[PDB]
């Protein structure tokens, strides 16, 4: 059993209401996970406003952005779930603000609020395809220069569709449709028996 300190669960819950009241607009489903972690959820339009309040509020200074990520729940209408994890050096606390973005409904960029996001937002576009308005320079950060398709999308094949080899005839590296010599063995692992939720 982990050493939970209820002292935290309460204080962070209380801040969660604080933020919910301060920004009744743009903020819904604020919940403190059973892991002593807060995860305000905001309407995509509240990206700029909610972050700024957290970066510049005396009672909630959240100066550095630990990470910007986008889980992809294909079932969910709004496929992506942009998650921004932020840290308060002054209050020794951390919070998560997560929004939802569909493939062709872009989110605002927070490079203004935190310049850390300049790179992570490019990372989210390259892997998942979400677009960020007002970004200084969006461009592939991790994928190859000519890569077609957004890789971390759940609908993208792991091996992908193209692989590279050197061809003598043309004396230059050349893509070809992927041909694998041992396909990824897809072990089915889920057990047909559940675990009675505690």
């Amino acid at each position: 059993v982990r050493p939970r300190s209820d002292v935290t669960h309460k204080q962070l819950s209380a801040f969660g209401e604080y933020v919910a009241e301060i920004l009744p607009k743009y903020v819904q489903q604020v919940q403190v996970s059973c892991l002593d972690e807060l995860e305000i959820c905001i309407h995509p339009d509240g990206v700029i406003p909610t972050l700024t309040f957290l970066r510049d509020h005396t009672n909630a200074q959240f100066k550095s952005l630990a990470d910007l990520t986008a889980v992809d729940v294909p079932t969910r209408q709004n496929r992506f779930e942009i998650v921004y994890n932020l840290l308060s050096l002054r209050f020794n606390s951390r919070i998560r603000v997560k929004t939802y973005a569909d493939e062709l409904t872009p989110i605002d960029s927070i490079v203004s609020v935190h310049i850390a996001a300049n790179w992570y937002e490019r990372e989210v576009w390259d892997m998942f395809g979400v677009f960020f308005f007002n970004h200084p320079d969006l461009r592939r950060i991790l994928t190859d220069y000519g890569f077609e398709g957004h890789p971390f999308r759940k609908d993208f094949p792991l091996t992908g569709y193209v692989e590279l080899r050197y061809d003598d005839e043309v004396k230059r590296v050349v893509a070809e449709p992927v041909e694998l010599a041992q396909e990824f063995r897809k072990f089915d692992l889920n057990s047909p028996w559940e675990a009675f939720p505690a």
């Binding site: 890789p151 193209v162 590279l164 590296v173 694998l180």
Partner: protein
């Protein structure tokens, strides 16, 4: 002896001894197997002792050790540098990530092996192939060169 056969073989050997004693490597240092090579260069297992120089640019490099994943973006470069080396050149693939694909074999951004982009002469196995193992691999390249008989084939051609 003066039979030109014994005149030649001997000459070839000299040529082989020179290339095999002084192999100047270059380490693309992709990934981590680079850390296990820096260890070779380091004091427990001195590479120089054998005549391998710690570092060399591509122009002056006899052998290229590809350590680490050869990702699809780096694949055009590897080739360039392989193509920018001298006429007597060799490639020692190091790491399961470069021998084949390694843990990242099924990925979309990793070339499944460097021998799909550069001809490879010795494949050194192991995720962090042990530095002693690289040293074993560099020593096997030395036995591969010793056996090469370029002038005798010229003479018999």
């Amino acid at each position: 002896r003066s039979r030109a056969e014994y005149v030649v073989t001997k000459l070839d050997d000299l040529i082989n001894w020179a290339r095999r004693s002084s192999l100047w490597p270059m380490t693309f240092g992709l990934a981590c197997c680079a850390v296990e090579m820096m260890h070779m260069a380091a004091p427990r297992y001195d590479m120089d002792r054998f005549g391998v120089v710690f570092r060399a640019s591509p122009r002056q490099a006899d052998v290229m050790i590809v350590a680490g994943t050869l990702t699809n973006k780096m694949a055009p470069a590897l080739r360039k540098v392989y193509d920018q080396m001298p006429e007597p050149r060799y490639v020692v693939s190091m790491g399961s990530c470069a021998n084949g694909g390694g843990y990242y074999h099924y990925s979309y951004s990793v070339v499944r092996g460097c021998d799909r982009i550069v001809p490879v002469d010795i494949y050194v196995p192991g995720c962090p192939p042990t530095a002693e193992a690289l040293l074993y691999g560099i020593l096997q390249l030395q036995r591969k060169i010793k056996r090469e008989q370029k002038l005798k084939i010229w003479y018999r051609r």
